[PDB]
Nucleic acid binder design. Structure first.
Ligand SMILES: [Mg+2]
Ligand SMILES: [Mg+2]
Ligand SMILES: [Mg+2]
Ligand SMILES: [Mg+2]
Ligand SMILES: [Mg+2]
Ligand SMILES: [Mg+2]
Ligand SMILES: [Mg+2]
Ligand SMILES: [Mg+2]
Ligand SMILES: [Mg+2]
Ligand SMILES: [Mg+2]
Ligand SMILES: [Mg+2]
Ligand SMILES: [Mg+2]
Ligand SMILES: [Mg+2]
Ligand SMILES: [Mg+2]
Ligand SMILES: [Mg+2]
Ligand SMILES: [Mg+2]
Ligand SMILES: [Mg+2]
Ligand SMILES: [Mg+2]
Ligand SMILES: [Mg+2]
Ligand SMILES: [Mg+2]
Ligand SMILES: [Mg+2]
Ligand SMILES: [Mg+2]
Ligand SMILES: [Mg+2]
Ligand SMILES: [Mg+2]
Ligand SMILES: [Mg+2]
Ligand SMILES: [Mg+2]
Ligand SMILES: [Mg+2]
Lengths: 252, 121, 233, 56
RNA sequence: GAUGGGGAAGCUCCGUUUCAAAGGCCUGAUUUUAUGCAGGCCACCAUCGAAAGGGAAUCCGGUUAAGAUUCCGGAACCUGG
RNA sequence: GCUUGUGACGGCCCGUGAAAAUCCACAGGAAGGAAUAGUUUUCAUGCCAGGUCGUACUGAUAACCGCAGCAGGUCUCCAAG
RNA sequence: UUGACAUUGUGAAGAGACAUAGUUUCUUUACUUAUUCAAUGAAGCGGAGCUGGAAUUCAUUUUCCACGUUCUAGCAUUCAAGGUCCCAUUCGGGGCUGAUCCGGGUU
């Protein structure tokens, strides 16, 4: 049989990202003297669309502490952040929408975006338009802070790991129906070549585990083992349940 | 005493002294003679009827010239070989893979004379 | 004063580009630099077995200075001196019928590793100087044991290269003394005595002493303010 | 066009006031006033917190 | 797609600023003299890849069996010096 | 009116629609500069130079690809009543 | 994927035998130098001390925090001005200080 579609995606020919128009990597300021002892001020000089990304970016300008020059960073614009605003990044920085602060320095209930996994990794969690993490606690000895991620997960990271106060702009984007093939077409055209999607049940056997038959049917359980092997995993992988979810989900 | 004071966090390759070659023996023995001289630059007149015209009516000499020779060398070697003064040289590559020069002299020199001085008609 | 103005600078983050400082502690050194330094560190952090680590007990500058000034008389023939010598005995012996003894019995420092070893085995050495260097440390480590079992007094000297200078090499790795002119006999006795009590006599004790295990000061000061506070309140 | 700006005299590339061929002269007025006021109120902050250090 | 590298029995595969001691400009110091040292920089890390993308500057008239914004005539302009 | 160019606006997007060479300007004030005469070549005029390779013609029911002077195929500009 | 052996080292507590001295072996939890991961044109790390001050003094300090920036879409660069010492007064120019000490473990 052939190599199925989800295997071909891995060698990255037609499947790489369509990156030409993107504004850049969105990162927090490198974690340096200023940010970890003090704060440092910058101005958002622009807030701009990023191609293939649902949330705006904020180009933020800072002085360079060690040389006469301007160093420009690209944040992910938090909702309510505006052009000309002053942004404060540092341990001793005040708590307002747009500032970047170590998680250890904010009371619980603070809502924070683009938050680092390890301190100084220049941001990881809750970057998509509309998401955010909450601080659900701190353990000052072996200093940690506990956060609830957008997935619902709870995770404990270093109290020095930096967030940025508030939620990411562009929320509600998924509420509007695409309405037609083209609107989706133009969507992935700026992301990657994932669209459209042939049902593996409409292929021949050589093509897919679900292929073939004199009627379209999966022919064997579509829940596949974690321990399955490449070319086997097409289906609901490692699924621990299945069927229409009835009842509220909402982690305890 | 104590340690040097480096103002920069970067460490660059020390600037070491670079010696010039003093060869124990010579490269090529005798140096090659001039590869493009005035006699090699300009190979023949071009006596076509239609090139002949350019000599009478245009004050232009028409030469078959080395493929290795540029406007400069075609001009200097014409000046040197024919005693004449050159306004501007135009060149082209003939379809048989030979380079043709249109040499326009200043109004001080008369090509037709200078053409049948070298002896073609 | 006159048109001049005192206008100090606020280097306090948030303002005033920092000045130029000594970043020497932060320099990103060539790999080869980082290795020779981290080798030294790595050699200190591991517990060092006692048959190494009996080095790092170098002779002390005073005793060694007395040992270098004594040894320095006994340098071997320079090329000039030996050419000068041959012309003497070449003429004098082949002519004046001397026994090929037209030259005196030499007194010089012995050296080279395979030389000094069979010397120690033959009990002809009265003093052996061993380097604290010698990167294939194997070439040397057995000498404290050998000198001990053969009753030869020895000392571990800083400067394998300084052993070189006195012997007219770049590096000698060992220098030994066998002979002595009677004028120097008495200082050697006292020199061997001090050295014997810093090395050979101590040896049987040093053989039980592991070295190393030394924390870096970021971790030393760390637990020094841990083991200070948590016990004594 | 950009390389043509080397074929023209500097008075085609500027207007007289400082930040001439650079900012729009309402924008220069803005950063004149803003400069003066912020340098002034800076002094207003030095002497007030100097009093706070004397009285406290 | 070379390079310090890292794989691979190996043909070669990986990497492209990557775990590398990665280079050159403005002038001074020469009045043994031709260019060493003196500062201060800049740390940009190959290169190939568009005859439809970007891009310094030319026009009209005339002329040939067949060339023309290229020749001839007139009138310009750009770049370097 | 037709073709084209262009402006000021307006509709559209979970699409908001390249890069680099290169050129200019500003902030800065390092420095160099006049009266027995200095500074100025971003004002005008004036001098010299501008290499290498392509340049013919066909571009199609006969100059290309279809075994061929094949009813097929093969990117585009100009466009009168 | 799971186990064992190797890479594989240092403590400490607790189990375990010659059968209740310590050579040894495993469980817990420490360690950092191997190995591993992130970051940066390896820039401010660790230790101490100045000054402040909350602090209550059971003789006096027994300590813990700090220890230049937040109305404003400005400006922040020439080893820094200041101070002070040097050169033999030329213009130029250099130390120290401004900018506290100690350890070179970039974090
Ligand atoms: Mg297959
Ligand atoms: Mg990509
Ligand atoms: Mg597709
Ligand atoms: Mg489908
Ligand atoms: Mg589907
Ligand atoms: Mg089918
Ligand atoms: Mg199958
Ligand atoms: Mg199956
Ligand atoms: Mg089927
Ligand atoms: Mg079905
Ligand atoms: Mg030509
Ligand atoms: Mg103007
Ligand atoms: Mg390659
Ligand atoms: Mg190219
Ligand atoms: Mg082109
Ligand atoms: Mg073009
Ligand atoms: Mg014409
Ligand atoms: Mg024609
Ligand atoms: Mg002309
Ligand atoms: Mg010019
Ligand atoms: Mg737009
Ligand atoms: Mg301009
Ligand atoms: Mg001019
Ligand atoms: Mg043509
Ligand atoms: Mg044609
Ligand atoms: Mg054929
Ligand atoms: Mg046809």
């Amino acid at each position: 049989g052939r190599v199925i579609r989800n295997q071909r995606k891995g060698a990255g020919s037609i499947f790489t990202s369509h990156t030409r128009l993107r504004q850049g990597a969105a990162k927090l300021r490198t974690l340096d003297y200023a940010e970890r002892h003090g704060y440092i001020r910058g101005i958002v000089k622009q807030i701009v669309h990023d191609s293939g990304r649902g949330a705006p970016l904020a180009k933020v300008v800072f002085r360079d502490p060690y040389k006469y020059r301007l160093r420009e960073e690209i944040f992910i614009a938090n909702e309510g952040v505006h052009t000309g605003q002053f942004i404060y990044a540092g341990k001793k920085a005040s708590l307002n929408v747009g500032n970047v602060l170590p998680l250890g320095s904010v009371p619980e209930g603070t809502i924070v975006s683009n938050v680092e996994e390890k301190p100084g990794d220049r941001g990881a969690l809750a970057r998509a338009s509309g998401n955010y993490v909450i601080i659900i606690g701190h353990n000052p000895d072996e200093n940690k802070t506990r956060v609830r991620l957008p997935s619902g997960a709870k995770k404990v990271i270093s109290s020095d790991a930096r967030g940025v106060i508030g939620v990411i702009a562009g929320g509600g984007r998924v509420d509007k129906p695409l309405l037609k093939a083209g609107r989706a077409f133009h969507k992935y055209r700026l992301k990657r070549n994932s669209w459209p999607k042939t049902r593996g049940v409409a292929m021949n056997p050589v093509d897919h585990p679900h292929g073939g038959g004199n009627h379209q049917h999966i022919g064997k359980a579509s829940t596949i083992s974690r321990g399955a092997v490449s070319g086997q995993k097409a289906g609901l992988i490692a699924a621990r349940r299945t069927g229409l979810l009835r009842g509220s989900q909402k982690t305890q | 005493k104590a340690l040097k004071v480096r103002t920069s966090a970067t460490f660059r390759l020390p600037k070491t002294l670079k010696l010039a070659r003093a060869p124990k023996y010579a490269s090529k023995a005798v140096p090659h003679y001039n590869r493009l001289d005035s006699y090699k630059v300009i190979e023949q007149p071009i006596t076509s009827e239609t090139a002949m015209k350019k000599v009478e009516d245009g004050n232009i000499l028409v030469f078959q010239v080395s493929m290795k020779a540029n406007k400069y060398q075609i001009k200097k070697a014409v000046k040197e070989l024919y005693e004449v003064d050159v306004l501007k040289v135009n060149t082209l590559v003939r379809p048989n893979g030979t380079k043709k020069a249109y040499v326009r002299l200043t109004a001080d020199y008369d090509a037709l004379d200078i053409a049948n001085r070298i002896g073609y008609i | 004063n006159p048109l001049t103005h005192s206008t100090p600078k606020n280097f306090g983050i948030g303002q005033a580009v920092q000045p130029k400082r000594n970043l020497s502690r932060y320099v990103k050194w060539p790999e080869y630099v980082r290795v020779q330094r981290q080798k030294k560190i790595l050699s200190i952090r591991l517990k060092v077995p006692p048959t190494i680590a009996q080095f790092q007990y170098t002779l002390d500058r005073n005793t060694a200075a007395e040992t270098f000034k004594l040894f320095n008389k006994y340098r071997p023939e320079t090329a000039a001196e030996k050419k000068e010598r041959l012309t003497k005995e070449a003429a004098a012996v082949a002519e004046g019928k001397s026994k090929q003894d037209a030259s005196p019995k030499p007194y010089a420092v012995k050296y080279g590793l395979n030389h000094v070893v069979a010397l120690i085995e033959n009990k002809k050495a009265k003093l052996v100087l061993i380097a604290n260097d010698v990167d294939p440390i194997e070439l040397v480590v057995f000498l404290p044991a050998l000198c001990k079992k053969m009753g030869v007094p020895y000392a571990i000297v800083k400067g394998k290269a300084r052993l070189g200078t006195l012997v007219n090499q770049k590096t000698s790795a060992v220098a030994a003394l066998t002979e002595v002119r009677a004028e120097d006999e008495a200082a050697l006795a006292k020199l061997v005595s001090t050295i014997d009590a810093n090395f050979a006599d101590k040896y049987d004790e040093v053989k039980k002493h592991w070295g190393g295990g030394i924390l870096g000061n970021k971790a030393q000061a760390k637990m020094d303010k841990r083991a200070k506070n948590s016990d004594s309140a | 066009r950009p390389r043509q700006y080397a074929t023209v005299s500097k008075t085609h590339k500027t207007v007289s006031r400082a930040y001439g061929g650079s900012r729009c002269a309402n924008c220069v007025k803005e950063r004149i006033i803003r400069a003066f006021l912020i340098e002034e109120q800076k002094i207003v902050k030095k002497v007030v917190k100097e009093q706070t250090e004397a009285a406290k």
